[PDB]
């Protein structure tokens, strides 16, 4: 009554619907097993956490700006005027059982979300997963990053703790007023009044439960549909031509490791949602516009923005009776970088000439100027971030505060040039380091030559050898070639027994002969498939 009822309900599902065609198409789909192809899954797998916590945070949070005295449990805030957003965020922190944990693992899931989006953008950038067939997928993923950034900024500003209330005052109301023609108009449309306009926090709650995460969920749905139906890309390797995806199928293997990786991402978020404090809004105060911190720094995925405020050197213009302030520039500048980050595949489609349907990836050493432009962007992000904690860097690492913001202000101009030089020539030297492992072998320990005194490194060749001390030099194929005989089948047979006690020797012989024959069968089947493609 456990397999018979499964067969009966399966024939019922096949009777009502006719799914088995469009289920077999799904659970025979192959995803490749490279590790970096899990990175964007983190941006999925934390995002579901952001719903599963976040829904829970919706049914306790009360947005308002109606000024209430606390009269609750938290003693250093009693009788103090606070917005009811902050009061019920304090109630999430201290009243409800396991409430501080759910809101902390929610904030940590937001950090892992907006950081894994950046890690995965680094993946699909430097591996070249964005040219011709997947450029719209880059565009909707880039827009998904923009919505992630703005929506998280609506997130930690949603209680008006004053560390983020001054973040609204800096970013969302100083830059918004600082836009030339229609700046004040979109400010007073966004707030409905002055800066503590009484319908800001509920408007952010409206945009932040549903209105931006509805668009984020729609773009993730269409995004994973573009990854799903239009097949996944892959690195080139042994049996990996342009028009096939090699790897594991969905049903026995990929579903198990994907669900287990969802569970381990949730484990990392839960461990660091418990063991590490985040946004301690009771240590912070209610937002009152006459008191600040010293840090006053945003969350890290937006620290490149007002760090760009912290580094742009006070250039204001004054036309005939008006004022362009500094905040126009970064309102241009954030509009600049996004217009380079959305529209990059069309930019280098124009520059390079990549008018070809690319499915195989390119290793990020194989494309040195694009990896170097990318490392310019990575190090420029790291500079604009690492000079946004300008304050606390100059605090702890004892530097003059003026000195470290000048270090940033020169660094955003000269350090992309330095990292472009180092990145371009480092990619070319990584190419040359695995283009001499083909013309020579793989390096090992030293033998001396017998009749005279020499020292050869005793290279182990990768392909066919000639009759003498040099092999037939292979051609490059976009693959990671192994540079250690370690990573080949050399000395990789320890005792199979236990960590403390050995198994009997016939069992060791059976296990190592069976595993050796299975690995031999793996490379034999992959090699004969590779010969079937060309032959």
């Amino acid at each position: 009554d456990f397999a018979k009822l499964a067969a009966a309900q399966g024939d019922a599902i096949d009777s009502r619907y006719h799914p088995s065609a469009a289920v077999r198409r799904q659970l025979n789909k192959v995803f490749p097993t490279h590790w970096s192809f899990l990175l964007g899954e983190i941006a999925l797998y934390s995002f579901i956490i952001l719903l599963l916590t976040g829904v829970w945070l919706t049914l306790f949070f009360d947005p308002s700006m109606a000024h209430v005295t606390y009269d609750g449990v938290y003693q250093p805030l009693r009788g103090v005027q606070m917005s009811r957003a902050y009061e019920t965020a304090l109630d999430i922190s201290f009243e409800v059982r396991g409430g501080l944990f759910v809101r902390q693992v929610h904030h940590w899931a937001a950090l892992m979300f907006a950081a894994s989006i950046m890690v995965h953008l680094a993946r699909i950038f430097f591996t070249g997963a964005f040219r011709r067939p997947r450029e719209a997928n880059w565009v909707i993923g880039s827009l998904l990053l923009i919505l992630a950034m703005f929506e998280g900024f609506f997130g930690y500003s949603l209680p008006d703790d004053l560390l983020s209330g001054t973040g609204i005052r800096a970013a969302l109301s100083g830059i918004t007023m600082g836009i030339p023609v229609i700046g004040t108009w979109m400010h007073w449309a966004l707030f409905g009044g002055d800066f503590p306009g009484e319908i800001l926090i509920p408007r952010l709650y409206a945009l932040h439960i549903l209105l931006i995460p509805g668009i984020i969920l729609a773009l993730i749905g269409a995004h994973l549909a573009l990854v799903w139906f239009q097949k996944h890309t892959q690195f080139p390797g042994p049996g990996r031509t342009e028009t096939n995806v090699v790897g594991v199928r969905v049903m026995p293997v990929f579903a198990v490791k994907s669900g287990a990786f969802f569970a381990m991402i949730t484990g990392v978020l839960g461990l660091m949602g418990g063991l590490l404090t985040i946004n301690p809004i009771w240590n912070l105060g209610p937002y009152k516009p006459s008191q600040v911190s010293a840090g006053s720094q945003p969350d890290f995925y937006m620290m490149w923005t007002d760090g760009l405020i912290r580094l742009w050197p006070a250039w204001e213009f004054y036309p005939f009776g008006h004022t362009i302030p500094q905040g126009v520039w970064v309102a241009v500048g954030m509009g600049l970088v996004f217009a380079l980050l959305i529209a990059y595949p069309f930019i280098e489609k124009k520059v390079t000439g990549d008018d070809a349907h690319h499915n195989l990836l390119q290793r990020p050493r194989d494309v040195p100027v694009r990896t170097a432009i990318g490392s310019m962007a990575i190090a420029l992000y790291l500079l604009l971030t690492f000079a946004c904690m300008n304050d606390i860097i100059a605090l702890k690492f004892h530097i003059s505060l003026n000195a470290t913001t000048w270090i940033g202000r020169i660094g955003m101009v000269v350090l992309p040039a330095i990292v472009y030089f180092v990145a371009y020539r480092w990619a070319i030297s990584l190419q040359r380091s695995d283009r001499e492992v083909l013309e020579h072998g793989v390096e090992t320990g030293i033998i001396k030559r017998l009749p005279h005194g020499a020292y050869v490194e005793l290279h182990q060749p990768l392909g066919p050898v000639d009759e003498h001390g040099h092999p037939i030099p292979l051609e490059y194929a976009g693959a990671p070639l192994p540079k250690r005989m370690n990573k080949l089948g050399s000395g990789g047979a320890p005792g199979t027994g236990s960590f403390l006690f050995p198994d009997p020797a016939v069992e060791h012989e059976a296990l190592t002969e069976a595993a050796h024959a299975s690995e031999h069968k793996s490379l034999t089947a992959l090699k004969e498939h590779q010969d079937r493609i060309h032959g």
Partner: protein, 382 residues
């Protein structure tokens, strides 16, 4: 090569799996099990190893249930019998939660990496440029729904439907946006000149004529008399002190008609003013600016707290160097001359409030700011 209808019940199960691969595009080359020799005890030991990980996951989930139900959490206030137990209530929650689902996940993926048979299934793609049937058939079907439905032959529907959807899209789009678009320059706030807009008006402005606007501090008392009237003898040499525009009308916080004319002061952005008391050995370093030479009071200066650009309160103040430093972007201002930006991302003089003493000797504002006090925007500086 054929659907194989009658010979399919005789067909073996792995041959059906390879038939599904062939009918979908896949071939599962090298699908071999992980433990091909049976009865070995390394298989049994990795079996009980992944059992150890999953049993740790179950034990830590049961631990979550126990330390979530049965735990002395509550906000026990401070150092008292029961405060250290609350200090690790949420870390115990997260330890049990993350350890539970991380042990279950590492058990499931160790079951994948030790017992689920490894495969390299290669799937023949069909990506890019759909074949000659499908392209031209969809093109013919769409051009039959366009050419056969007799658009692009009726000019008057072809433009009137465009004018209809365009005019309705404009009306519906402005119906979306028209509830949002407020005029910032509608005169809202009452002022001595009349009704001025909000950006040219802090709470420091006079309402009818010269009225006593006391530079009152905020003694941070929970509700009862939060704004105490100020004398010059209170602040002393080398002292920042934050003053607010309190008045004789909105008195203590002991009436409900107050605490809304009184928290309005504490919530309005352009209200806080720092009251600088420069040490009088450093009064020869001061150089005032235009229209602003008598905005001191001896050595009392009143510079605003809201900074030049992007409106954070610049409540950092350095005596003995005399620099109003802001925290949000670290922009210094010179406290001596007038709050010109010494250094930072600001480019404008942070505004200065005039000071006199009242009858009975209390610090009052000698009018409004001469410039709009908050962050910059378009309509400024003429």
């Amino acid at each position: 090569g054929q659907p194989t209808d009658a010979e399919l019940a005789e067909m073996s199960r792995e041959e059906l799996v390879k038939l599904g691969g062939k009918i979908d595009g896949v071939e599962t080359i090298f699908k071999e099990p992980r433990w091909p020799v049976p009865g070995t005890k390394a298989e049994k030991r990795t079996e009980r190893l992944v059992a150890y990980w999953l049993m740790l996951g179950g034990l830590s989930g049961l631990a979550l249930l126990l330390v979530f139900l049965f735990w002395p959490w509550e906000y026990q206030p401070f150092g008292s019998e029961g405060e250290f137990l609350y200090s690790l209530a949420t870390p115990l929650y997260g330890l049990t939660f993350g350890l539970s689902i991380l042990s279950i996940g590492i058990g499931a993926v160790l079951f994948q990496k030790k017992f689920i048979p490894e495969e390299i299934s290669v799937q023949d793609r069909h990506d890019g440029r759909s074949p000659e049937v499908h392209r031209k058939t969809v093109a013919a079907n769409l051009t039959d729904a366009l050419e056969g439905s007799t658009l692009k032959r009726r000019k008057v529907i072809g433009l009137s439907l465009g004018i209809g959807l365009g005019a309705f899209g404009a009306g519906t789009l402005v119906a979306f946006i028209g509830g949002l678009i407020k005029n910032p320059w509608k005169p809202v706030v009452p002022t001595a000149e009349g009704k001025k807009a909000v950006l040219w008006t802090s709470g420091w402005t006079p309402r009818f004529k010269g009225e006593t606007i006391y530079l009152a501090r905020a003694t941070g008392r929970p509700g009862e008399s939060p704004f105490v009237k100020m004398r010059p003898e209170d602040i002393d040499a080398g002292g920042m002190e934050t003053v607010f525009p309190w008045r004789e009308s909105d008195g203590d916080g002991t009436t409900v008609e107050s605490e809304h004319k009184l928290t309005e002061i504490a919530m309005g952005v352009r209200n806080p003013v720092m009251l600088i008391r420069i040490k009088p050995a450093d009064m020869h370093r001061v150089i005032k600016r235009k229209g602003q030479e008598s905005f001191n009071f001896g050595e009392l200066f009143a510079y605003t707290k809201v900074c030049s650009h992007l409106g954070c309160p610049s409540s950092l103040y350095e005596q003995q160097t005399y620099r109003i430093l802001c925290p949000c972007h670290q922009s210094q201002f010179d406290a001596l001359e007038f709050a010109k930006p010494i250094f930072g991302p600001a480019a404008r003089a942070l505004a200065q409030l005039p000071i006199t003493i009242d009858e009975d000797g209390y610090l009052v504002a000698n009018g409004d700011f001469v410039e709009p006090v908050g962050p910059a925007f378009w309509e400024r500086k003429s």
